[PDB]
Write a protein that binds this ligand. Structure first.
Ligand SMILES: COc1ccc(NC(=O)Nc2ccncc2)cc1
Length: 171
């Protein structure tokens, strides 16, 4: 069976229990933690591309009030459908399964300033989602995994000083 497992889930849950935050900027900002997954049950002989996108978790935005994240208004129009193509794409199942698949280079932005960056809206919650696309397939078969442990709010600046401190402590 195809299995995609989250690497460093215990790390992710340390941020998740504070409510996790990722900085978005004009020129784009790498994530911490980095999304990494382990893969078993691909055809080692076949070729596949790895794609990553970020799904809006809620029909509302968030605000940090008295040290607490709370619903903070009605959402902004959905961010334009940005997909990050893993730079190893396309590759053999053997390649993707031999070591963890890391999205270390993905950049999160609040401006449509190109550069393969992902456009997010500040104060909105997103869930990372990975797609495995089989190359040369007339059925264009795609499998999609979501990672609820990796949920975060996009911010132009950190709200929770504990998050600001965790980020320094573990990075
Ligand atoms: C809850 O206690 C934990 C403490 C540490 C981790 N993992 C961790 O820090 N990983 C890491 C890897 C490489 N560079 C920096 C950090 C998980 C749980």
């Amino acid at each position: 069976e195809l299995r995609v497992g989250l690497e460093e889930s215990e790390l992710w849950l340390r941020f998740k229990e504070l409510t996790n935050e990722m900085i978005v900027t004009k020129n784009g900002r790498r994530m911490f933690p980095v999304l990494k997954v382990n893969v078993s049950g691909l055809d080692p002989n076949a070729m596949y591309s790895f794609l990553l996108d970020f799904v809006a978790a809620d029909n509302h935005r968030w605000k940090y009030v008295n040290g607490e994240w709370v619903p903070g208004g009605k959402p902004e129009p959905q961010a334009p459908s940005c997909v990050y193509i893993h730079p190893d794409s396309p590759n053999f199942g053997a390649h993707w399964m031999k070591a963890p698949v890391s999205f270390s280079k993905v950049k999160l932005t609040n401006k449509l300033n190109g550069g393969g960056q992902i456009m997010l809206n500040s104060l909105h919650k997103y869930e990372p989602r990975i797609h495995i696309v089989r190359v040369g397939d007339p059925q264009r078969m795609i499998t999609s995994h979501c990672f609820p442990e990796t949920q975060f709010i996009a911010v132009t600046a950190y709200q929770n000083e504990e998050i600001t401190a965790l980020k320094i402590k573990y990075n």
